[PDB]
Amino acid sequence: LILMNMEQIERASDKIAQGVIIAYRDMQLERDEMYGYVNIARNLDGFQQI
Amino acid sequence: MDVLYSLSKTLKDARDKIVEGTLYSNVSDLIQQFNQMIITMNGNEFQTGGIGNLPIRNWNFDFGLLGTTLLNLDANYVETARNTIDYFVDFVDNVCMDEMVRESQRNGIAPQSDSLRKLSGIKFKRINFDNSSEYIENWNLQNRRQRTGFTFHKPNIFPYSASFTLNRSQPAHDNLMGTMWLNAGSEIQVAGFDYSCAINAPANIQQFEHIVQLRRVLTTATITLLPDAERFSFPRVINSADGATTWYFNPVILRPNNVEVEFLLNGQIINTYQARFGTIIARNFDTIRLSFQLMRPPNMTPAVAALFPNAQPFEHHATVGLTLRIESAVCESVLADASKTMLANVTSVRQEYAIPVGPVFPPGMNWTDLITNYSPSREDNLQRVFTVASIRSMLV
Amino acid sequence: MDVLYSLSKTLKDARDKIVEGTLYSNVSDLIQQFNQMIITMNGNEFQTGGIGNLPIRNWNFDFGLLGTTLLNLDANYVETARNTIDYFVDFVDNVCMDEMVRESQRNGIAPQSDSLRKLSGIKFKRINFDNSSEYIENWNLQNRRQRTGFTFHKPNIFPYSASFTLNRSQPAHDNLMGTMWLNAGSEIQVAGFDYSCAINAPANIQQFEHIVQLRRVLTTATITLLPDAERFSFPRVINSADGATTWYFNPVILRPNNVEVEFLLNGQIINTYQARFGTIIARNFDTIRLSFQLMRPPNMTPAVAALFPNAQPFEHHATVGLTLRIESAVCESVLADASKTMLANVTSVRQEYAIPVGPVFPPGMNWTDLITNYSPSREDNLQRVFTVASIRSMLV
Amino acid sequence: MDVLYSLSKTLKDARDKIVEGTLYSNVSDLIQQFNQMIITMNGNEFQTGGIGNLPIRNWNFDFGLLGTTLLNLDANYVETARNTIDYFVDFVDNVCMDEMVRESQRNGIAPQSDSLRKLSGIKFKRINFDNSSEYIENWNLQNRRQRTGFTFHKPNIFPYSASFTLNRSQPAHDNLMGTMWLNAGSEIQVAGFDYSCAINAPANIQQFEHIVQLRRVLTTATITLLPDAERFSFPRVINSADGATTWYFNPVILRPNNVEVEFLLNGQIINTYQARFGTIIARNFDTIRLSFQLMRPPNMTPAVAALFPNAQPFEHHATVGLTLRIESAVCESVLADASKTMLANVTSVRQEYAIPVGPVFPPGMNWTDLITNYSPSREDNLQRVFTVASIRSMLV
Amino acid sequence: MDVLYSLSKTLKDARDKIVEGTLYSNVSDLIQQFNQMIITMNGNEFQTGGIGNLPIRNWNFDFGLLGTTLLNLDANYVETARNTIDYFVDFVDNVCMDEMVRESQRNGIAPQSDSLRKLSGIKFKRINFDNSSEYIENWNLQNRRQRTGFTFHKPNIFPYSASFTLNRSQPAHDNLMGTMWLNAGSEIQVAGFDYSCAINAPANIQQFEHIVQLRRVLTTATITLLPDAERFSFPRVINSADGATTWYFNPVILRPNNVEVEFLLNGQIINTYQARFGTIIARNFDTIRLSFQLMRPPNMTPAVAALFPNAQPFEHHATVGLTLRIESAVCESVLADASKTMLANVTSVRQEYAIPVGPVFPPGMNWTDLITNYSPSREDNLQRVFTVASIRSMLVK
Amino acid sequence: MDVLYSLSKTLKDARDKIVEGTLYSNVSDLIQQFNQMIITMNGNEFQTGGIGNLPIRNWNFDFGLLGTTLLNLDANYVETARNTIDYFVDFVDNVCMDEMVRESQRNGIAPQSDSLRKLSGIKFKRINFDNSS
Ligand SMILES: [Cl-]
Ligand SMILES: [Cl-]
Ligand SMILES: [Zn+2]
Ligand SMILES: [Zn+2]
Ligand SMILES: [Zn+2]
Ligand SMILES: [Zn+2]
Ligand SMILES: [Zn+2]
């Protein structure tokens, strides 16, 4: 139970993020109901992961 | 292929085991594997192709996990599981169909559809679990360069061929010596005929030989050997080699003499059976040699002696036949047989969606042409599609 | 039915897995399922009925649970398990026998015996676990109106019929044109005969047609086609249609001409095969149409020309054959086949206990009568009894 | 035998389930069983093969346990497991081969090879786990003397025998009355012939009887019965009983009359079918009694009346036939059949290593000789070797 | 196989690089590999050879490690290393010989000798290091089932066959039309002969065809095609097909006409070369079709016209040749070729110790029989023994 | 050409030497060269083909470095390395094929394909190592 719900519990935390994409192109800030404008990535597709 | 099989097996086990009232301990590992599959597939977009009349289909996966905290499964659990199982089964069936209708010459064993190539990526290796079916087991063993075999009941190893050879003939076709045969599927019927009944033959014996060269090696083969060929035991009107005219065959069946059935591998005799009929075992062979003799009966009752005069006209033609039926065998390669539906499934899927003729298989997946020219590329593509068909059979 | 199957599966798993010295980890889930079955069945009284000569049997369940506190199973554990397993196996066998000998016109799919009706109560659904057999899979699918599938090796789809049709006849029966066939099991042998050898036919062609209507739709069928029919290739004395007289048949086999095998679904040609014999695939069909022509050979050697005069008397009769064998197929309905034993088991149980003939099945469970008039009620009752037979065959 | 089967089953499970990326929950129980096997086998020396050309192989077991700590299996785990599995699979195959090539007249059911004798000790009984295969299941049931069952598709129960009986004959063989039959494998083709066509027979009926005594009792048997025996329906020149001459047989096939097929157990009629053709069920029998009749057609057309004169010479000989195929059956003893490969495996292993003829089996494992004299000692040895062969086929 | 190859490679590197006076920095990694080998082999017992006249050899490994404190290698260090290397090389030679003389019908690619079976354990996998030889590289690719490639100079792809076909003949053998060929090794010499010189032919053209089916597919093949076949260009007395009599062949060579070389794969034309002589490339093929015409020269000088009369007797017979030499090729399977010695080594070892005829290979390692019936099991066994032979050649040779 | 040769030889040495169970000291220098190649190639976009029936192929490099082991390489290391090695081998084969099918009357010795022209830039000279063939 804990193992299968780990990722959901972790992503619910308000004090840690799951990563940061450094893309040296200008990307529009997403429009999110929780923030307004926010530089939030929904996934990491299209980037090398370290 | 292992990931596709694992998806299919997970879905089959979910259908079989996720049933109302069952103890969760009966399905705990299955639910763990199912949730692993969901997690691995979530967030991935798949496309099953538009080859032929097969429609382009897009697949998304954003499913939640199944519960793991009941003592016994209830109706809500089964309905919730079924909702996901239906979508996954549809996706697997479409991926299998897309892979079944494609072929390649350079690399026919590798996946051909984009969905199966995507599933061969490392990120999906987590879905992989028990590979127990015969076809997937053979696939994994062969990827390991390990000796593996498919077991066939009545293997379809002989391309269809009804033909004859006239070792003695004439334009009027009234004094003929030769052989007639049908090699069809797992069956060989051969018959040597002499119109003169070896009246002018050395020792009054006429020798007939029939060699059948199998396109693949067979091992641990159980074979029925019977001393007569009923297919060539009644009057027939038969075209000539060029079709210019038709000749007449009026057999009178005699016991074949000095019957020797040799099963050979690389030209060396592996098994030899002399005057043995019934069940015989050919342990490892690629060629069958049937030698038999028409022996003129030294003593004949008047009714018999009437049939075989000293000279022409010959109205009754002496024939000796053999029948060889391969009941069961083992092959390194894949073959059509009387028990398995792989060839039928592949042909049906190709026919239903009007798949054009490719560069590998003959039109219509015709088995006679396929087995006649069983090239390595054909073997690779055929094993790939047969494995995919077996995977599809688990769900469809 | 699912609860009865689950009882049988649990007992089979207990027989196979509960062995001396085995790790308890090998049986933990099986032991839990077994103890759950014991708890569910404990305190219940069953009666397997006295229909026919089947004896009335009373069943009481007061059994202790199997232990869960060993590292490896020992002889004590195996004996304690085996006593209970023997009693439960006897009970399951008797319940299956009680259900197999029963039928109804209204709800033949529903349980008929009192014991199986009792097992269909909710208080037994806890016993239900893995439904992995083909028959139980199809039972669960059909209970949900889902696409079912049974794979048959040599399906017994054709009711036995050795018949003939004379399209040209007269009291002398010396100039006959027509067809004779044997449709038995998975095999159709047909032969069209012309006594005149199409001397007066237009273009010297005689056309023969044989339509066989299957009582159920077959899918993904692999079929062997052979040019000649050996069953109608020897001289016979055949009774007349009324049985008043006997006529004489003296075939001489010519190869069939313009062979067309059509596999049709609702009168629509799904598959067509022209002049192809070796091995063919019919993906979905319920009717087989075999068209074949006797063509008088334009060029004949003196013997062949002797066979076929310009007018009567006709002593040699030109015959063109055709053999069609369904090696394997898929059907949405249960069928008898050469590999399974369900029909044999049901018939044996009904014969051994002198079960009186019922409203649904023909006397003696005769398969020809059953498949000739395969009604929906007959299908439901047959599926029920065949599923029960498969359940019983897991333990007996 | 149970320990050898458990070794083979554990290795098959390891090969099929220990795959890269698989959840450890999919293998946890299997890993426990595998580690138990390693612990049990470690420190033991085995020797296999000193008979025929089977090489002497020495086996030492010093292997580490598999890990229990991963969440998903990775490459390292699979490589270690694969190395251990390869060694163990080779050992099991060699032990099976060593056991298959040995026989004993006294205790042929007991292990013959020293390796299997060592494995029968208590110190190896821990390896034993799930015994689900039909052959090992029957082995265990036989050890306890419970009722065994082997299901055979086309059981090979009739030793090959093509012979005839002449109830009426004379030196010229022009007026013969008798029967000729082929009892081969799973088929009985029997034809009764009368050269006079029952012209002088009382009521113009000639009675023919054929009794086939099965060497073992068959139960739940599905039988195809067809009116005609095509094998004896064509002109044939047949040796005399002493071989001093040959006689002529020119059959004209009349349908058999008053066909009665009885299936007998201990001389009592268990089943009886009168003029029933197609699929029939024989639930328990050891003898087949086919009684049929040639009835002279009371009404004949001019051609038919021309076939059968009032006295000699008789140029056309009236023949009635019967074909009987056992599609499927159940036997309490092991038998060769079309679908399995046990006989083929044992014969191939004995032929490959040139095993000298022993005191139990016929040379070459001739099945006709084996089933002709199916003694209890032969039955014990054959069940032993067939079970070992089924164990070996799980891996090899 | 990889462990045996790694043993041989380590030993060869030690023999080549552990030399007096060399910097320790030249051999540090090699010394570590050698000591790893010593540690892995120490305390293990091996037995090699109980087949034919090959003696039973028992091998024990109890060796000290080579030192690592030197900055340059001195004589004593090299001598001790040489003693250890000599023992190890003897062991590796014997293991290779034991493996080369064995064959299996089932798993011919798997180890057959018990020493190599023991070396196939996990504990010995530590010995594995650089696998750079062509044969071991192909072995590792084949284990993973990647596209293998063996480069052969003059591949021995054609089994020996000197035969002829008569399309026109009669018992006097004075008016013959046909072809005679020798397919031997990497060479095909074919020659079509017409005794009448196509006097009565349809437009004075006689077409000849020769089909050669390769038992394995060849890729990237350099092939020399020469117009004439010197092998069938001199007077010959040739047995009849039945051997009942002998006939006479007095050829006069005319240049072949409309020469067409067709290189086909699975009965599909891959390469076609028309009237092209010299070096040609066949990129991927398994069948060669050589079609060539004898064209009667319309204009003849008096001597040429005297050679070919209008009718019989025909004293001079018109012949057109073709020579095809595969200089180099690539095959996914092992083959005998001119440059390598793998087949020679395997046959030499098998003959040296009187290895009895096995169930796989022909009765004596005859290459014509092997390539004639080059079955998958034979291919596996041949690849195994050839890889072992190449491993042995690194040390014994 | 020297850079393309160095890529090919680095890949050949990686295939031959990065084998399960080998001492990390047997590959240390090779691993350093391979990681230098990965660093230099990562983030670069290459295109091959577009001539005849040679397909247009796009190559992107976003690989991580090969790690280290204390004593001996294991199976996990070999598979992880082999994924990258396979991609690089495919890229090198495609670049070689693109270069083999092109020719120039002027400067026939100079690179003709765009991929090889890019590989002749200064940034890739880092990859260059032993030119021994
Ligand atoms: Cl069958
Ligand atoms: Cl040279
Ligand atoms: Zn002819
Ligand atoms: Zn009538
Ligand atoms: Zn069958
Ligand atoms: Zn007699
Ligand atoms: Zn000649």
Side-chain angles (χ1 to χ4, degrees), chain E residues 164 166 169-170 173 176 239-242 245 247:
Chain E
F164 62 87
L166 292 174
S169 100
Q170 84 285 126
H173 294 81
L176 297 194
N239 63 275
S240 57
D242 283 357
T245 180
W247 46 287

Side-chain angles (χ1 to χ4, degrees), chain C residues 64-86:
Chain C
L65 297 207
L66 263 49
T68 61
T69 69
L70 287 177
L71 255 289
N72 282 90
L73 300 197
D74 63 307
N76 286 7
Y77 198 94
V78 174
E79 287 319 78
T80 288
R82 262 171 197 182
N83 226 293
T84 313
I85 291 158
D86 288 356

Side-chain angles (χ1 to χ4, degrees), chain D residues 92-385:
Chain D
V92 167
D93 162 57
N94 270 254
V95 172
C96 287
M97 276 186 300
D98 205 324
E99 192 66 14
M100 286 159 68
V101 298
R102 299 179 191 277
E103 59 201 70
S104 172
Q105 295 210 306
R106 234 284 176 164
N107 305 286
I109 202 74
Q112 304 309 313
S113 66
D114 56 354
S115 279
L116 203 57
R117 286 197 184 97
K118 183 165 153 103
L119 287 175
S120 61
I122 57 108
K123 77 142 100 153
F124 299 102
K125 193 50 151 268
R126 247 82 184 288
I127 287 157
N128 198 33
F129 91 127
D130 178 21
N131 305 333
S132 47
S133 100
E134 297 297 320
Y135 266 76
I136 199 69
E137 183 181 352
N138 274 299
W139 188 266
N140 297 138
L141 292 160
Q142 164 262 131
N143 278 338
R144 288 133 60 193
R145 209 200 190 189
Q146 322 307 133
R147 182 181 185 73
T148 49
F150 294 97
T151 309
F152 301 101
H153 171 51
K154 293 175 75 180
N156 206 308
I157 183 54
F158 306 128
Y160 168 83
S161 66
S163 48
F164 63 88
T165 288
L166 293 170
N167 305 99
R168 185 183 65 243
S169 68
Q170 60 296 125
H173 294 82
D174 50 62
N175 187 39
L176 300 185
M177 188 269 288
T179 35
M180 54 179 53
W181 59 90
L182 172 68
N183 304 342
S186 202
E187 190 189 39
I188 287 157
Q189 266 170 310
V190 62
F193 53 89
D194 194 358
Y195 283 26
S196 69
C197 195
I199 188 72
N200 307 305
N204 297 283
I205 308 286
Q206 183 52 234
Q207 246 290 334
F208 307 111
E209 203 194 57
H210 190 44
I211 303 167
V212 193
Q213 290 174 13
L214 286 60
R215 261 75 181 198
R216 290 296 187 276
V217 172
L218 287 186
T219 60
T220 313
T222 314
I223 321 289
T224 298
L225 196 80
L226 294 175
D228 302 314
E230 307 173 14
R231 168 156 263 251
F232 301 118
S233 297
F234 41 87
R236 187 195 284 281
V237 164
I238 306 158
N239 70 270
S240 62
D242 55 314
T245 186
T246 36
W247 44 290
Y248 185 39
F249 184 44
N250 197 39
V252 49
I253 303 314
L254 282 62
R255 83 194 169 191
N257 166 257
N258 277 111
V259 177
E260 294 144 2
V261 184
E262 295 175 353
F263 297 92
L264 299 325
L265 191 82
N266 300 292
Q268 305 306 309
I269 305 174
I270 311 308
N271 275 113
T272 189
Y273 295 96
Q274 278 141 256
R276 255 275 283 289
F277 301 107
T279 297
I280 51 177
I281 301 303
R283 64 183 174 86
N284 188 20
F285 73 101
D286 57 4
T287 321
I288 310 177
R289 185 178 173 285
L290 307 119
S291 77
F292 47 111
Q293 300 184 141
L294 177 79
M295 171 172 181
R296 188 180 172 82
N299 303 315
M300 303 174 173
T301 51
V304 177
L307 304 170
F308 312 124
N310 302 113
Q312 311 189 45
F314 296 128
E315 305 188 312
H316 309 274
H317 313 138
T319 314
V320 286
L322 279 184
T323 308
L324 194 147
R325 291 201 203 95
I326 313 181
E327 280 92 292
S328 212
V330 175
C331 186
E332 271 192 298
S333 313
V334 298
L335 293 170
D337 71 324
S339 298
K340 309 183 200 186
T341 72
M342 256 61 68
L343 177 63
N345 288 138
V346 177
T347 299
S348 299
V349 163
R350 270 155 179 272
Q351 289 166 350
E352 173 171 359
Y353 304 107
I355 305 301
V357 73
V360 171
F361 292 131
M365 293 292 285
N366 190 317
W367 179 245
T368 287
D369 292 354
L370 194 43
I371 193 69
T372 299
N373 306 305
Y374 202 14
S375 67
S377 170
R378 261 141 185 250
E379 198 192 6
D380 295 326
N381 283 269
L382 199 66
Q383 194 182 0
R384 191 180 37 77
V385 301

